[PDB]
Amino acid sequence: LKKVEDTLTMLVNATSRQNAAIEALENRLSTLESSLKPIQDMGKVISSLNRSCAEMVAKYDLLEH
Amino acid sequence: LKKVEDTLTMLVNATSRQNAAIEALENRLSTLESSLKPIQDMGKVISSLNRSCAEMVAKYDLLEHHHHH
Amino acid sequence: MLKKVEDTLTMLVNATSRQNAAIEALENRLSTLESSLKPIQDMGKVISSLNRSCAEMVAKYDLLEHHH
Amino acid sequence: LKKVEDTLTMLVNATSRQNAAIEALENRLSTLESSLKPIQDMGKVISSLNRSCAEMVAKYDLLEHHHHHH
């Protein structure tokens, strides 16, 4: 009785320690995801720079060769 | 028995919570995995830019060379 | 009474094993996620290289202006 | 106590295995945070590339337009 009550309350404590540790891993993933949010729409910037550079190549080739 | 039965109920609840916590964690990883896809998809376009930018450099540098010397 | 107590504990043993398997599967997904970052890192190098290159050509254009 | 004590010991050992599994997850997450740093910073470098590549284009357009008319 005494040894098992002592064990059960350890388990409740151990489980809640695990819980906090899981929730803390969740927050680390949130932080990581929100930091990647500004980068998500920057494929179009890269695309526009590729167009510019491609247009300059085309303009060069036209006006000279 | 009563102190055992109450501490067991707390443990059921603690275990119920942990299941929910693991699933919230699973879901937040899915969302992270999703956030990286559009960044992975910038591969092709970055390589395009790399070729076309290098091609503009080679051609226009030559022209700054002849204008200056 | 006592029969409810023993199988509720068994229920928790099975529950905790499934959590364990779920945590180990999370870890598996994190390795896989890491491995896949290598090409995105490399894209970053190219981006860094192209920036320094474009900065370098602006500088070269300016020196001619500073000269004659 | 018979059935209860032997279930408890399994539950105690399972809760102990869980701690180790959670810790291995923290390790792998620390390494994932480390590997994501350069990617978290490339948004900045993309923006700086935007303005320096834009500056290169506008200025080299002039160089070539001057070269065309002369």
Side-chain angles (χ1 to χ4, degrees), chain A, chain B residues 1-63 66-67, chain C residues 2 5-65, chain D residues 1 4-70:
Chain A
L1 192 73
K2 183 71 181 162
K3 179 62 176 173
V4 306
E5 288 155 348
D6 287 331
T7 305
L8 290 161
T9 62
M10 160 171 185
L11 286 171
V12 170
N13 188 36
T15 304
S16 298
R17 263 184 196 174
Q18 293 163 349
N19 257 290
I22 293 296
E23 286 155 6
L25 293 163
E26 195 205 325
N27 293 329
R28 286 162 71 181
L29 299 182
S30 292
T31 299
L32 286 176
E33 197 196 319
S34 72
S35 69
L36 300 179
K37 189 63 179 134
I39 299 156
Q40 286 199 230
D41 52 357
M42 291 188 173
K44 77 204 166 201
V45 169
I46 297 285
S47 294
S48 64
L49 294 167
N50 185 42
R51 258 191 304 283
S52 290
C53 295
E55 286 159 347
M56 291 299 284
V57 170
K59 189 164 178 189
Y60 186 101
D61 291 342
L62 187 63
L63 291 184
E64 309 209 279
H65 301 147
Chain B
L1 208 60
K2 293 171 191 185
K3 285 186 177 181
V4 168
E5 286 214 273
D6 294 333
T7 310
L8 184 53
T9 282
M10 293 182 75
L11 187 58
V12 174
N13 291 340
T15 306
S16 293
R17 291 194 201 86
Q18 181 148 123
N19 275 359
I22 288 168
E23 295 195 356
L25 183 50
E26 281 166 354
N27 290 337
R28 208 91 182 81
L29 181 51
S30 300
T31 312
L32 186 59
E33 288 168 330
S34 287
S35 281
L36 283 163
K37 280 187 187 62
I39 305 177
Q40 291 168 350
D41 298 337
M42 293 167 47
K44 296 160 206 298
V45 201
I46 289 162
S47 292
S48 308
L49 176 54
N50 194 62
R51 289 172 293 213
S52 66
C53 184
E55 190 175 358
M56 184 181 80
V57 170
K59 287 176 189 284
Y60 280 84
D61 190 309
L62 184 60
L63 200 137
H66 295 135
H67 187 264
Chain C
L2 196 66
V5 171
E6 67 182 38
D7 54 37
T8 302
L9 293 159
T10 314
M11 183 203 75
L12 291 166
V13 168
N14 295 326
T16 309
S17 298
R18 294 192 303 276
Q19 292 167 5
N20 188 271
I23 296 297
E24 211 200 314
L26 283 174
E27 193 186 353
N28 298 0
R29 282 166 70 182
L30 294 181
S31 303
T32 303
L33 189 60
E34 288 218 65
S35 302
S36 68
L37 302 182
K38 249 145 198 74
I40 306 159
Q41 270 154 23
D42 300 333
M43 288 169 215
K45 310 310 198 218
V46 172
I47 288 287
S48 172
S49 180
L50 291 167
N51 181 42
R52 291 189 68 263
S53 185
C54 291
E56 182 194 335
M57 286 291 112
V58 161
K60 193 164 180 176
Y61 183 100
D62 293 344
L63 265 73
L64 175 53
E65 256 56 58
Chain D
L1 200 140
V4 171
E5 182 49 48
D6 298 348
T7 315
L8 275 163
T9 195
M10 289 189 291
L11 184 48
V12 173
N13 297 327
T15 307
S16 168
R17 270 194 301 286
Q18 187 82 339
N19 297 323
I22 287 173
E23 291 180 347
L25 198 52
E26 295 168 351
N27 291 349
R28 195 151 293 283
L29 194 40
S30 295
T31 302
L32 176 72
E33 286 167 340
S34 178
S35 293
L36 278 163
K37 267 153 201 158
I39 295 155
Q40 290 170 303
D41 294 348
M42 93 182 285
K44 187 180 288 188
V45 186
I46 285 166
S47 292
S48 98
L49 185 134
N50 189 53
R51 60 178 136 73
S52 72
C53 184
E55 196 183 343
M56 192 193 169
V57 167
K59 287 189 174 177
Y60 275 93
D61 192 59
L62 300 177
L63 187 71
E64 191 222 36
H65 251 133
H66 170 80
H67 190 277
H68 183 234
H69 287 112
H70 304 88

